[model samples]
Target: KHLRDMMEIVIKLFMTGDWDAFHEMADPDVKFQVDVGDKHIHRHGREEVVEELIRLLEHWRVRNIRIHDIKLIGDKLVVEGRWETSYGDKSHDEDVELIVIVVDGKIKKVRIIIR
Candidate 1:
């Protein structure tokens, strides 16, 4: 299933720090917008998406993640979860909301609401 594959790809990306390849899995037309600590950024397409994620990951270290919930609405998939991370030796747990739209087998849009 594409959902299963997408989920696995996301988990592996975070666990392995393969942010580059991770964003590559996204649909080429994917649109991503994220809000972190009063900062909201929008990205359109693969390049913008990958670059933004790379920049964020560089600042924090991903430790572990758990998938709390997942739902499919029409051609869209929504994943809700929590992850453990540390920034400069300061570890904390954060909530993440990932919204993705898939067509055929590729993602078309992904909006990440990260806190």
Candidate 2:
């Protein structure tokens, strides 16, 4: 139930582009990591994580992101989705998966996998 609620909050943030709500729900020590083929980056702390995410969005020129599913498994919230982006002269339609960890109702860690 709690995970479902969190999923709703996440969807709202994504659809509305509400960074304020994201910061409120994120732990100060939150960590974010991404893996896409041979590329991987990790960031720690709320500010750094948020900055890195924004950087990626800009770098990729993301046009659309869709969340197909979000489910709770044990302590992690697993999300599966796809995104469309254009970088330089290349356009990309990528499938992705995300694992989100929550502690004390705040976001603790996020792991993203681009498939």
Candidate 3:
């Protein structure tokens, strides 16, 4: 029950770009990694993770994000979704998959795959 509830709160934070709320639920040692095509980006600790997310969102000019589906498998939450954004003058849309690990009601790590 708590897992689903926490997942909902995190999803809300993502959709609304409420970094504060998201950060509040993140562990201090949180780690985030993303695989984007040929490149891999990673961040350690809550500050780095939040900074990286902000940078990416700004660079991509993300306007909206949607989670199409979510599944829970043990401690990991698998999320399938997409985000609409513009890189410079080019409009872009990409599909994303995320594996979110929750520990003690806080986000411990997240792995993102973008295609």
Off by over 4 Å in 3: 15-18, 63-66
In candidate 3, position 81 carries an lDDT of: 90
Question: Which residue runs does candidate 1 get wrong by more than 4 Å?
Answer: 1-25
All-Cα superposition RMSD per candidate: 3.0, 2.3, 2.2
lDDT of each: 0.73, 0.80, 0.83
Question: What lDDT score goes with residue 53 in model 1?
Answer: 73
TM-score of 1: 0.71
Model 2 clash pairs? none
Tens-place lDDT per residue, model 3, 1-115, is: 9767767667566656558876888899999999999999989899999999888765566667887998988778899999887867788789999888888888899898999
TM-scores of all candidate predictions against the true structure? 0.71, 0.80, 0.81
Highest-lDDT candidate: 3
User: Could you give candidate 2's per-residue lDDT for residues 1-115 as a string of tens digits?
Assistant: 7667756666466434647777888899999989989998999999998888677754567667898987887657888999887867889799989888878778898898997
> What's the true lDDT of residue 101 in model 3?
86
Worst 10 residues of 2 by lDDT: 9-18
Sorting all predicted structures by lDDT, with the top scorer first, yields 3, 2, 1
Kindly give the stretch of ten consecutive residues in candidate 1 with the minimal lDDT sum: 8-17
